[PDB]
Amino acid sequence: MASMERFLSVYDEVQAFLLDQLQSKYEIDPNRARYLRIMMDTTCLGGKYFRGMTVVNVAEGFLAVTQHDEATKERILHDACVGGWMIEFLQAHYLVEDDIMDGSVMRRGKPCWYRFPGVTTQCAINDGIILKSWTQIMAWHYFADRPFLKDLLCLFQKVDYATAVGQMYDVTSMCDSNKLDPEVAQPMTTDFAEFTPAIYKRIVKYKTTFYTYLLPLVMGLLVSEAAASVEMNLVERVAHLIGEYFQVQDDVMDCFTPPEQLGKVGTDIEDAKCSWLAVTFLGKANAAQVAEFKANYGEKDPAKVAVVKRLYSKANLQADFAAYEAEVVREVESLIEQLKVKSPTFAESVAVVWEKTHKR
Amino acid sequence: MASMERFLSVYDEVQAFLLDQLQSKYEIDPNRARYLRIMMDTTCLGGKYFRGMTVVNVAEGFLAVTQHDEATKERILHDACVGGWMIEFLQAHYLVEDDIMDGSVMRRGKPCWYRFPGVTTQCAINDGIILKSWTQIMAWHYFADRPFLKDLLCLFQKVDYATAVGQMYDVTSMCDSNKLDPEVAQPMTTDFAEFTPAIYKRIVKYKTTFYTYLLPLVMGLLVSEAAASVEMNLVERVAHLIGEYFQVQDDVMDCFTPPEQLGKVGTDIEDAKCSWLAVTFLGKANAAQVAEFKANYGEKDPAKVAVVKRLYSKANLQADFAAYEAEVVREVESLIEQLKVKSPTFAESVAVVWEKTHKR
Ligand SMILES: Cc1ccc(CN2CCS(=O)(=O)CC2)cc1
Ligand SMILES: Cc1ccc(CN2CCS(=O)(=O)CC2)cc1
Ligand SMILES: Cc1ccc(CN2CCS(=O)(=O)CC2)cc1
Ligand SMILES: Cc1ccc(CN2CCS(=O)(=O)CC2)cc1
Ligand SMILES: Cc1ccc(CN2CCS(=O)(=O)CC2)cc1
Ligand SMILES: Cc1ccc(CN2CCS(=O)(=O)CC2)cc1
Ligand SMILES: [Zn+2]
Ligand SMILES: [Zn+2]
Ligand SMILES: [Zn+2]
Ligand SMILES: [Zn+2]
């Protein structure tokens, strides 16, 4: 069976299981089940499934080099699909809540879930809670007797928690740290002293790399019983590196990809986000450029947003991006090679993850 | 040591552990740690700790009848405190998010967390996520090698999930089921056909009884290694019964307790909630009363809210409440007795839980 149709089939299976259980154990009525069905589909489906399919691809890599009965191949692949959906539904939780937190309008060319007329914020906050609760119910049902249950649940939680800490670092990235205070409304920084490469790398490490790259790779190892084919410090290092590059790309696209292809109107400028473009621009600007940036950034006024975009274009950030890209290519290739000391197979899955990111 | 000072001490311990770990493992800076500290205190502290202290009291009950080394008594009590905080922090998650979902102003005579000036909804949604993530980090740290870890984590998840399903039943309780539809803005029911005792009991069972009464009782059994001193179907039955009574009391207080003592201005009428008062009123009203209720319920207009309160007062709902209370007293005493077949001790803890609820 091809991997993607397997993965999509298991979605239907898992959906049916969740909804059936709601009717048999939680007293749900058919109409609320239908609401939840539609919510699940709307929030979990229509992406590329990169994350969840990475679990499947890592497991397929090991299957090719490990002896197993056919029934065991099938079980491993089924477990990789269930694990992949756990990550997809965890992402769906994040996207639902982040869209509400940010006041976002669109995502992938459709309205954010909370904006649907019969949803509203009141229900959407809790729908997003249910999305993450479903990752747990999947795990406890499908993995009940698996030797990797403990390790998978402990990994998932730590990744979830890193991700929420990353969200805190992102939402507070334009405040001055020393002014953070629940009692006092938070002003935008005026110095931008915290718009540094290291502070940027911390936001991105936590907010996206743990759930986007570390979790799918490590979940593929766990369902394969293969965590001894790797040196875990290398897997962390490479996940955090590729993940950062991925986010740099998104940051650049927020500013410069047309909204039709981007799937939304990018607002990182208006939102005063600590983006790669802002940090890179500040890292090369002269005094007059810095002052122009300060006078215009973090404002809704379209004229001011256009002043920032013009500053970025004139500053030749494409060159800084090429230099960054080159360095990432170097270090990701060095880590892949270190990963072959223990598993050629795992190293190749990491190569493929790299190729999908670099050349999307 | 007295139980409550033990419990409060462990709060300080757990807080220090969480914040220390954020600095050693998650790259947090001192100012963000302070924000999180203040968030934790603000959202977790200042209640009665009923839930968390019930775990401690169940464990203290068993300790009095079971032989153990002193160091084991201490470990069991420490584990009961950590488990109790897991429930308190899970409640804090619920209250933070519910206050945002409902647009609430106050809770326990102070502003809702999201209303604090330096918080805002954007940060508060994620603070509430972190609250629940912390229940997991507590568990994996303090219970890493405990024989009850699996059972405790599986119980916690199912309780969390029931609670979120209960929130869905609550937020949708004034819609007609057959009209639920993400695509269509939801009208208030005009027939109130779904304001029944059974539908009410389903909302309340899920939204509060699993986390308020079942989880503390069962967590006390788990940290005591005492789940064989009970018949679990009886523990469920009694938890769901006491929990329902608790919520009926809250529903009555929302309408009739002065806001100063209630800790907030009650809005269940304006919010069109399926409250015990509404369901009981509809269960005895004549046609003219029903029509007056329909014309006034679920409106912000204070004059209309006063018309509903007047209908309730004239309908002698205090008598229906006394009749309900009497019946609950009967059934809770019958269940306590059934609980003595296997554990006098556990039955007495349930008696105390009952006494704290009935006579608060
Ligand atoms: C010990 C060992 C022997 C052979 C192989 C290759 N193998 C072919 C048959 S299979 O269906 O098991 C898929 C992988 C790997 C390991
Ligand atoms: C409450 C909450 C916690 C974490 C996240 C992380 N999220 C990942 C996806 S992202 O980078 O698109 C937007 C941030 C979101 C919400
Ligand atoms: C810093 C920088 C890097 C690259 C580009 C070019 N850009 C790449 C792909 S895109 O969809 O973002 C639109 C075109 C511009 C600026
Ligand atoms: C087998 C058994 C013997 C005695 C007891 C009572 N016991 C007193 C001493 S203690 O500190 O262990 C607390 C409970 C219970 C069980
Ligand atoms: C997102 C979410 C899920 C569940 C709850 C349950 N909560 C219990 C406490 S309550 O009855 O006060 C208000 C409802 C809240 C929020
Ligand atoms: C249905 C019903 C029951 C009891 C009461 C009396 N009430 C009890 C406590 S209270 O703080 O809600 C205010 C006074 C009135 C109506
Ligand atoms: Zn965001
Ligand atoms: Zn972005
Ligand atoms: Zn609510
Ligand atoms: Zn209430």
Q: Tokens 């609980």 appear where?
A: B339
Identify all chain B residues contacting A35, using CB atoms and an 8 Å cutoff: 172, 180-182
The pair of structure tokens assigned to A67 is 């002896």
CA dist B299 and B271 (Å) reads 7
Q: Whose CA is nearest to atom 6 of ligand 1?
A: A65
Identify all chain B residues contacting A102, using CB atoms and an 8 Å cutoff: 122
CB of B161 within 8 Å of any CB in chain A?
yes
CA of residue B318 relative to chain centroid, distance: 24
**Which of A91, A95, A101, A159 to mutate: most B Cβ within 10 Å?**
A101
**Which of B19, B31, B149, B176 to mutate: most A Cβ within 10 Å?**
B31
In chain A, DSSP finds a helix count (H) and a strand count (E) of: 15, 2
Q: Is there a contact between B277 and B293 (Cβ–Cβ < 8 Å)? A: no
CA dist A215 and B286 (Å) reads 60
Q: Whose CA is nearest to atom 12 of ligand 5?
A: B95
Nearest Cα neighbor of B159 from B90, B108, B210 is B210
Q: Is there a contact between B152 and B139 (Cβ–Cβ < 8 Å)? A: yes
Q: Which residues contact A77 (CB under 8 A, 6 or more apart)?
A: A1, A6, A56, A59, A60, A63
CA dist B132 and B144 (Å) reads 18
Task: Test A180 with B28 for CB contact under 8 angstroms.
Answer: no
Give the orientation angle of helix A70-102 with respect to helix A30-44, to 10 degrees. Answer: 90
Q: Whose CA is nearest to atom 15 of ligand 3?
A: A318
Q: Which residues contact B206 (CB under 8 A, 6 or more apart)?
A: A26, A27, B162, B163, B165, B166, B167, B169
Domain count, chain A: 1
22-81 in A: which are within 8 Å (CB) of B? 22, 26-29, 31-32, 34-36, 38-39, 42
- What type of residue is B43? T
**Which of A133, A156, A196 to mutate: most B Cβ within 10 Å?**
A133
Q: How far is CA B138 from CA A329, B18, B324, in A?
A: 39, 8, 39
CA dist A148 and A154 (Å) reads 10
CA dist B314 and B310 (Å) reads 6
CB of B110 within 8 Å of any CB in chain A?
no
Please indicate whether residue B97, judged by its CB atom, sits closer than 6 Å to ligand 5: yes
Phi, psi of A177 (to 5 degrees): -55, -40
Task: Test A206 with B26 for CB contact under 8 angstroms.
Answer: yes
| Containing structural domain, residue B94 | 1-360
Please indicate whether residue A249, judged by its CB atom, sits closer than 6 Å to ligand 1: no
CB of A165 within 8 Å of any CB in chain B?
yes
CA of residue B233 relative to chain centroid, distance: 20
Q: Residue A297 region, left (φ>0) first, then alpha (ψ -120 to 50), else beta?
A: beta
Q: Is there a contact between A57 and A84 (Cβ–Cβ < 8 Å)? A: no
Phi, psi of B111 (to 5 degrees): -65, 145
A184-214 b/e (C-beta count within 10 Å ≥ 16 → b): eebeebeebebbeeebbbbbbbbbbbbbbbb
Q: Is there a contact between B113 and B119 (Cβ–Cβ < 8 Å)? A: yes
The pair of structure tokens assigned to A158 is 């730590």
Q: What are the strands, taking DSSP E only, across chain A?
A: 106-107, 110-111
B37-75 b/e (C-beta count within 10 Å ≥ 16 → b): ebbbebbbeeeebbbbbbbbbbbbbbbeeeeeeeeeeee
- CATH code at position B238: 1.10.600.10
Instruction: Find the largest Cα–Cα distance for chain A.
Output: 68
The pair of structure tokens assigned to A356 is 């999908």
Nearest CA in chain A to B182: A118
Identify all chain B residues contacting A133, using CB atoms and an 8 Å cutoff: 157, 160-161, 164
Please indicate whether residue B68, judged by its CB atom, sits closer than 6 Å to ligand 4: yes
- What type of residue is A53? M
- Method for this entry: X-ray
